[PDB]
Amino acid sequence: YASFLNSDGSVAIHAGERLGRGIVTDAITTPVVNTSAYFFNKTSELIDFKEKRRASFEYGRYGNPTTVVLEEKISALEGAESTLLMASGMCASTVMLLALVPAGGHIVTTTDCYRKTRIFIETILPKMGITATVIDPADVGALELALNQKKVNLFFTESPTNPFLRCVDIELVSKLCHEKGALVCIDGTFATPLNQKALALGADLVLHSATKFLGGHNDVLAGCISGPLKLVSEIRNLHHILGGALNPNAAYLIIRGMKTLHLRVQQQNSTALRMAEILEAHPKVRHVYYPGLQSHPEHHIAKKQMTGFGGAVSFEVDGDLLTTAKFVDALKIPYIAPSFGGCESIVDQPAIMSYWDLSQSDRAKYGIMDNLVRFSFGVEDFDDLKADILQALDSI
Amino acid sequence: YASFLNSDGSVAIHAGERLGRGIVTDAITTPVVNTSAYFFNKTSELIDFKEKRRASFEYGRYGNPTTVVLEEKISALEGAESTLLMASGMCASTVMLLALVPAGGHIVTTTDCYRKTRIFIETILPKMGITATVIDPADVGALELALNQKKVNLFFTESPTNPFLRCVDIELVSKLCHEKGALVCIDGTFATPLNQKALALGADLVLHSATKFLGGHNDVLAGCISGPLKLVSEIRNLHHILGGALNPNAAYLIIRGMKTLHLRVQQQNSTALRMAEILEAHPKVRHVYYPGLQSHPEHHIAKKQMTGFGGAVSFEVDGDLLTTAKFVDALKIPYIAPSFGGCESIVDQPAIMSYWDLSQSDRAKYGIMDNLVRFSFGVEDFDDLKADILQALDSI
Amino acid sequence: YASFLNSDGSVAIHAGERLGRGIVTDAITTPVVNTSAYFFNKTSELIDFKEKRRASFEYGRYGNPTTVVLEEKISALEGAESTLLMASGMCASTVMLLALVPAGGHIVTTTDCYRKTRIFIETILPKMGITATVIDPADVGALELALNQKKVNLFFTESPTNPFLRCVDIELVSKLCHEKGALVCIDGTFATPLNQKALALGADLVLHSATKFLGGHNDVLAGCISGPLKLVSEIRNLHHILGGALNPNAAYLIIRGMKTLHLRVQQQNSTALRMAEILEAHPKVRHVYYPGLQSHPEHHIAKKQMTGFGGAVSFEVDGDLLTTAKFVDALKIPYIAPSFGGCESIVDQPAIMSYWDLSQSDRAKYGIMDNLVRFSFGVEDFDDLKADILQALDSI
Amino acid sequence: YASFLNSDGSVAIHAGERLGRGIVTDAITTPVVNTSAYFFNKTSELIDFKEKRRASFEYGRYGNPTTVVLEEKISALEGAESTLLMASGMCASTVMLLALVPAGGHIVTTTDCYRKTRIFIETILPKMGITATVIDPADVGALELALNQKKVNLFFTESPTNPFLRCVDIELVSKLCHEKGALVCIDGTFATPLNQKALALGADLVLHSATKFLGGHNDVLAGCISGPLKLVSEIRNLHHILGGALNPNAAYLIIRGMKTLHLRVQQQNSTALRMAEILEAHPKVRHVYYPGLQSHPEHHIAKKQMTGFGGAVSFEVDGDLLTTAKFVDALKIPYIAPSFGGCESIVDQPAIMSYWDLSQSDRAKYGIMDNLVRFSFGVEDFDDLKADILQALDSI
Ligand SMILES: O=C(O)CSc1nc(-c2cccc(Cl)c2)no1
Ligand SMILES: O=C(O)CSc1nc(-c2cccc(Cl)c2)no1
Ligand SMILES: O=C(O)CSc1nc(-c2cccc(Cl)c2)no1
Ligand SMILES: O=C(O)CSc1nc(-c2cccc(Cl)c2)no1
Ligand SMILES: *Cc1c(COP(=O)(O)O)cnc(C)c1O
Numbered sequence A, B, C, D: 001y002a003s004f005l006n007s008d009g010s011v012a013i014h015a016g017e018r019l020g021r022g023i024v025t026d027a028i029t030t031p032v033v034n035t036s037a038y039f040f041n042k043t044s045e046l047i048d049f050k051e052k053r054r055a056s057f058e059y060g061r062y063g064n065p066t067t068v069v070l071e072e073k074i075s076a077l078e079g080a081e082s083t084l085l086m087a088s089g090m091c092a093s094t095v096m097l098l099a100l101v102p103a104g105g106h107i108v109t110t111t112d113c114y115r116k117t118r119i120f121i122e123t124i125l126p127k128m129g130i131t132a133t134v135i136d137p138a139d140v141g142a143l144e145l146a147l148n149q150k151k152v153n154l155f156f157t158e159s160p161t162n163p164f165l166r167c168v169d170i171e172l173v174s175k176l177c178h179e180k181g182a183l184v185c186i187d188g189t190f191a192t193p194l195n196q197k198a199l200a201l202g203a204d205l206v207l208h209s210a211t212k213f214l215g216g217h218n219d220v221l222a223g224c225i226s227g228p229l230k231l232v233s234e235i236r237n238l239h240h241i242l243g244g245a246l247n248p249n250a251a252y253l254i255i256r257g258m259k260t261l262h263l264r265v266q267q268q269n270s271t272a273l274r275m276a277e278i279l280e281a282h283p284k285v286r287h288v289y290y291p292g293l294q295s296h297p298e299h300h301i302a303k304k305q306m307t308g309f310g311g312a313v314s315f316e317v318d319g320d321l322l323t324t325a326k327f328v329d330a331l332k333i334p335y336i337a338p339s340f341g342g343c344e345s346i347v348d349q350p351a352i353m354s355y356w357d358l359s360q361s362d363r364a365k366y367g368i369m370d371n372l373v374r375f376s377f378g379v380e381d382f383d384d385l386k387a388d389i390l391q392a393l394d395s396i
């Protein structure tokens, strides 16, 4: 992007702005364009554009000046060729799939997945006769195996994973896949372009739910995919059809958020780590999950490919369903709700939060224990948080 | 909704507000809630909600207080059981399809369709093995015929149609379809809930591109579908997965726009008509399409089911591609761009605007002549507009 | 503004937009610029601007692209040289005063004034030793008299007046004033640039509280002053100091509202009149105030300078404090609150709404009877409204 | 505010939210209420409110739910009784003055002031016969002296000062003044409630231009005053008249900005210091101003009352007008413009930026040398900035 800029933070701030905006203004910030369409001065021009001789979005669903900024911004961060922005991560992933995976095609994905993302694959994709294989994030064998058994079109997974933050050796996987012509799409939502550059690692496509960290204010939804033009475009097209365009105001909000991405991520990364150990050492804490700890299975991989470990920490409390609840109920700072990555801390009991619809047995089918607890450390002051968590345990 | 509010206008203004908002405030307008998620006071409550004992959107993608208002508002207008709001009409229709039409199923639709909507049906649905039949809007025979030949899941079409505003005898069609268990979905975009109540006519589902008239300010994209709960919900579900949620700010803008829906539509309906005749009578005007005129094929139907004829008028100029262009180029008030229904007037040459990608021959395959011109009369003053149009004709 | 546009409405729509925006974009609507300041490419340029060789706002308090639009727009409507936009009408009038009236200066104003505006004059201006004389809106003699007795710096008043919508023969007054070198500033809030052009009538400065009609959505506050550059600028300066700048988002909302100004005003003007008569004819209605009726004192003047009579109507109910309340309490459509001019109808009992702080006696000092009722007819359907009003008159 | 919240950071995040909002919502963020007024359910209620038995804003100019949050938020940080929010700092200071200083009264203020603030005092206040005395920030004698000579009504000054960041020993001054019944109002804009609590130091009123740090995104204007109720309210009253209300959307943006106040300030404080020293040590750098350095006059006081030194740094370059310019022109990261405190870095040459209107001579009357350069360090990465600055020097 720029030469005088080298740190991500500086980028996340001026990427796609400091230099130019294609919207010319003596204003420091990016202006919010609220238009439903774009006009032409004269037919001759309209022809030029349609003949690919001029530049324009044509329709709001085909783009927006305020948006392209955020688009380019992210692109620079992830260090990609191009980026696309949906109305929400779900949209992103969802589309991307229907976009790249052909009919009757096959796809590979890890067991640990985002509840919703799971369903789509287990209920929608089959309609298009698209079959998929579920393997463990670590089980490289299975991947290599399946890679040979069937003709995989694309391997899709997020790393860190959810809710056990299991990580995948991108570099390695990308290799094994690219060997068989498969595509590698990683959902580094939990990671953040700052904590890892899946693309540089070899991945083909990387996508995040800006709804979480990128926006980090819990006041907007948005999804995004970044990667080589040749690929991303293909999606953009289908996107223009499914029409899941992201509103400018939303885009701005995100751009504004990314102004302090590094600052936040940094703080979150810390609080997470420290609290993690503190939690791991705590007696009432049965188990704790966090790539930062050595106790974590892929910890070594985490170190080898990440420079941080996010601000999300999962852990099982030494108690039962009711008891665990009593714990969260004790907390006074974090909000009890889904989502994560915002300035405000959040906690939840997956078992209930998003798996209560299942049976105590089927729940275990995924490792979701009435014990497990997810904690998205906000940006509040460590001590204030720690104290809260601790005091919260002294209630059982 | 209310017992003291009968006129649609009054409704479009206070529907889902005047009484209550479920967001309690001494404010006149609906408050814009910019949240990515919703929290719970205590686990006990989260359980209640999950157990369907409490009310909450859970996640921003599953709803929003600012949105439900607009949702209820529209619901009242169309006099439906419930309404859903997407990020754009395209999304709406696109989803609604994948939602109701099963795999390998069959769907019937008219020849005159929105370019994009067409493609989706001709390139995506086939993937799910979904076959469809294209018939003329008037050709009731074909419908009844196909209604028997194959097993139609749903008949989808807009009325007025585009760009020839061909209308469909809803009532009749609804009957013929419901007789064979097929579903009838009408895209009353061009119409507007004020000019026609497709639902009352018998239709099962009605959807508009709020991007156009509902918003009527050319500053926001949004789609919406309304109808019986039992049905709309099924879609809402799939919606929650594809994640094409509409941003609050957008929702508000629309709510703000509908405050003057009637006012606008009225003005637009008139200007259209008058200008239509005036245009029809003009020597340089070869042909003019508008349900308001008798010259219109389904004019009788238009009168029987409509109370207005929108503010959109299409017509062929007595000239050639280049000449016609010279005409639009002469206009000084309307903007040359797609979209329509906004306060500002808009014009375009379909042949170029959205079919230039096709051959002179293939173009005619749909009646799209280098002659045809679409005119979305804005809300500007009649005389001002008429004078402009006329002056732009002598040029030829 | 432009040649082809001659109807106020068309102007309120394309004024300062259709042609150019100085913010260049292929967008239909005006982009919202959210910046706190403006930069320069190089010192040489900064010098140029500072030396008045380049164009720029310099600081957000010194202007904004998104705002200048609304600025010019209004300017066109009122057919003025230049317009200024404050954060609220109050700011406007308030500033304008301290801006034009010198220390120890004198000013003339009518008895019927906006509560607040009054106080400022009766409590702040005195601090600067500024004395003022209060006269009856009609009593031209007093004005002419005072015009001679002391040396008036400026005659300030609003027409129609509040809450008796008393009007002032601008043209005449302007004459008498300009003869003695005095300045005439009219607050045509209740009027609207569409119902009258005080400027053309001879007035020096006209100002409205965009909070009411211009925005007419009851979702934003804003004031504006329009008139000759030589004058307006002098205010703008002091403005740049007191720093009461209007936020861009607000500006936009207004610009968006004015898109349907005419449409609204029209509807409002009608409903008002009709209802007015109907009300006047009603038995339980003791008296009715509206320039549209002949019963109105300055009705002739109203006809001579106005083309409409607003959508505001005041009237005394045949009852006592408690009874009158019971009436408003019966209404089901209008909201009980201050303000007015929005799509939503509003009602209030001045005696209480903004005079309850005064004694039953002191109240009468201004004609404010526990009887009087102000009714800002919204944009709802007439029948719906009338029916409501009537039905509430049977409860007494 | 809240027990479990001690670190300011945590407060700036949950102050006036985490607990309650008086706007009840299961939403994480504060909803943006866009209303111009507030209604009442029935007259009886209206009476109650007017009789001070109920709670309501009555009019939008009299408050707003979305605003009060930010109000309470700041209140908590500054640890005050109450806070008020204007449309801009200028508005704040401006109003505050006319609000507290009586007619013919006297006020004391330091020489180093905000250009605009200066004029207001030197051109407007005199109208109200308000005389003022200018003294050096450090010269305690003068203050004490003047404190006795005349009857001071209030001592107003900002610390750090501009553009030399001179600081004032609040505690001391507050003492000297309170001894003579004078009021102490400090403009800790440059400081930030995080780097100092003037209120705790004894000051009576503290105010900042949220336009700068509080918002820290260079995309919104707003001013705010905080202090004892008995005092602030007196201002709020006059404010309700002058009507300089802050728009909700503005308020929100700030609220959203403060979510990462600490995070930012922290980063800024560091970059500033480091760079300062590095600058001071640089040969081409004649002088450097920063309370963090020992070279600074009031450095000791800075240490005794501050915990930070802001992210603003002033310094004189070893060159002449033209040369200095050549320097800023070399910089590639910071934007050349007024304002400061935003994520983006800013630079300027006061001599030109806001004093070019004066003579080379009159300029020195305030120390403004064609040498001096102001640098508002953004939040970009240190190395990136440093590298830029340095490189911008070897260019001489
Ligand atoms: O249960 C699921 O898999 C999807 S629902 C979901 N909850 C959270 C979540 C909620 C609170 C804290 C943290 Cl770290 C995560 N993220 O997705
Ligand atoms: O070609 C298509 O149908 C898709 S692009 C499109 N243009 C318009 C359109 C443009 C101007 C006026 C009118 Cl009435 C309609 N509507 O959709
Ligand atoms: O009482 C005053 O003068 C100031 S408060 C005020 N209320 C209204 C008002 C309120 C409802 C309807 C109508 Cl038409 C006007 N206008 O100013
Ligand atoms: O010059 C004045 O007094 C008013 S204009 C002004 N510019 C800056 C300013 C500009 C750039 C950087 C820094 Cl630290 C400050 N601060 O006030
Ligand atoms: C939270 C999350 C999503 C959801 O994104 P939305 O924008 O809210 O739809 C998708 N994927 C992962 C891996 C997540 O953690």
Ligand SMILES: *Cc1c(COP(=O)(O)O)cnc(C)c1O
Residues within 6 Å of the ligand: A061, A243, B087, B088, B089, B090, B091, B114, B117, B158, B162, B187, B189, B190, B209, B210, B211, B212, B221, B222, B223, B339
């Ligand atoms: C304009 C239009 C669409 C497009 O809706 P978007 O929200 O702009 O995607 C779809 N259908 C009809 C019938 C239209 O007229």
Ligand SMILES: *Cc1c(COP(=O)(O)O)cnc(C)c1O
Residues within 6 Å of the ligand: C087, C088, C089, C090, C091, C114, C117, C158, C162, C187, C189, C190, C209, C210, C211, C212, C221, C222, C223, C339, D061, D243
């Ligand atoms: C309503 C009104 C005002 C108030 O304007 P704001 O923008 O709401 O402060 C001022 N003057 C008159 C004459 C009014 O009628």
Ligand SMILES: *Cc1c(COP(=O)(O)O)cnc(C)c1O
Residues within 6 Å of the ligand: C061, C243, D087, D088, D089, D090, D091, D093, D114, D117, D158, D162, D187, D189, D190, D209, D210, D211, D212, D221, D222, D223, D339
């Ligand atoms: C920057 C600044 C202001 C300006 O505030 P606005 O909100 O931009 O009007 C006022 N006072 C001081 C001391 C400042 O440094």
